[PDB]
């Protein structure tokens, strides 16, 4: 809108000519002096087009830069599930919804947000049978009643078995091994 208003308003600029109207100059002046001053107007009006055309070329590049971003971001998140951090929404991305717009696109990014965090005392491994038992997944926690293994995305207890715990290296190697008995 501002690009077209500038292209419009400089039709009425004199650009140092006798007027900004070619009809005034054809009527008032002699065909030598008329032809000079309308030539002064024809080059001021060409420069106003060239400036407008150039700044359309710049913003046509930036919108293509976002359109190539949106065509990617639709394929990444609408047509799938993203795994990049904070791409397609803040948190943990689940899915996203495209919505049309008069000159663009509006996304609706569905994210997961954890909360309600609680203290649990932790340690790397369990020293059972003289063996440093490392968790196959998750970390070791003690909630004040039981030692067990849970994830870090959410709190959920699991009984410490050899199916979710394994050993690489014996004891007295890792600093801070749990001295507990497991199954």
């Amino acid at each position: 809108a501002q690009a077209l208003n500038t292209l419009v308003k400089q039709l009425s600029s004199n650009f140092g000519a006798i007027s900004s109207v070619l009809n005034d100059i054809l009527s008032r002046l002699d065909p030598p002096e008329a032809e000079v001053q309308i030539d002064r107007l024809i080059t001021g009006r060409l420069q106003s087009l060239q400036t407008y055309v150039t700044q359309q070329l710049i913003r046509a590049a930036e919108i293509r830069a976002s359109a190539n971003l949106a065509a990617t971001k639709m394929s990444e998140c609408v047509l799938g599930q993203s795994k990049r951090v904070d791409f397609c929404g803040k948190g943990y991305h689940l899915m996203s919804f495209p919505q049309a717009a008069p000159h663009g696109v509006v996304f609706l990014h569905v994210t997961y947000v954890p909360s309600q965090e609680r203290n649990f005392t932790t340690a790397p491994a369990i020293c059972h049978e003289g063996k440093a038992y490392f968790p196959r997944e998750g970390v070791f926690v003690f909630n004040g009643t039981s030692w067990f293994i849970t994830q870090r995305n959410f709190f959920s207890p699991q009984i410490i078995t050899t199916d979710n715990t394994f050993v690489s290296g014996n004891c007295d190697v890792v600093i801070g091994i749990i001295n507990n008995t497991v199954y």
């Binding site: 309308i38 024809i42 976002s66 663009g104 947000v113 909360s115 995305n153």
Partner: protein, 186 residues
């Protein structure tokens, strides 16, 4: 040597041709003006920023009526401060921090706060919080929530076209004949 020049072509310093004293020249004052407003709805007073000036010459030129432009109803109002941006006039200094509402420059912002009036303050980055450190404990999330956030980005543009003779000529015959001497510039 009679006078000195700057790194441009301007003579920044002259010697007195009478008593040989060496005198710098300062380009008395100019700069831009911005208008700091709460909006026409929320108030009717505005604050002006005289950009990149010493407030000694600004407050002088207000009272000495040496300003261009000048307003018929205008006053300094005892609220003038020299920041790195220049002379904010029409706003009270606040020496605590808040979040940036309207950005001014060099970390200082402004808003329309309770006495409401226009006040100037320094931007805060956030809360003075802390992340404790343990060698033994891990905080683990238990409950949760979901949230849907929207974002928005253009993918197109109002594509135009411009005819030359309805723009540079207005369909006059003489303009079309001069246009032949510029070629197919159109």
């Amino acid at each position: 040597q009679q006078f000195g020049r700057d790194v441009s072509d301007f003579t920044d310093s002259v010697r007195d041709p009478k008593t040989s004293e060496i005198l710098d020249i300062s380009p008395c004052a100019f700069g831009g003006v911005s208008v700091i407003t709460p909006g026409t709805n929320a108030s009717s007073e505005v604050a002006v920023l005289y950009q990149d000036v010493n407030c000694t010459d600004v407050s002088t030129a207000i009272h000495a009526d040496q300003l261009t432009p000048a307003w018929r109803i205008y006053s300094t109002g005892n609220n003038v401060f020299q920041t790195q941006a220049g002379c904010l006039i029409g706003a009270e200094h606040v020496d605590t921090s808040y979040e940036c509402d309207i950005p001014i420059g060099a970390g200082i912002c402004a808003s329309y706060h309770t006495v409401k009036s226009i006040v100037a303050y320094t931007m805060s980055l956030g809360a003075d919080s802390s992340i404790a450190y343990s060698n033994n404990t891990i905080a683990i999330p238990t409950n949760f929530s979901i949230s849907i956030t929207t974002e928005v980005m253009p993918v197109s543009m109002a594509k135009t076209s411009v005819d030359c003779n309805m723009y540079i000529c207005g369909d006059s015959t003489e303009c079309a004949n001069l246009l032949l001497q510029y070629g197919s510039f159109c």
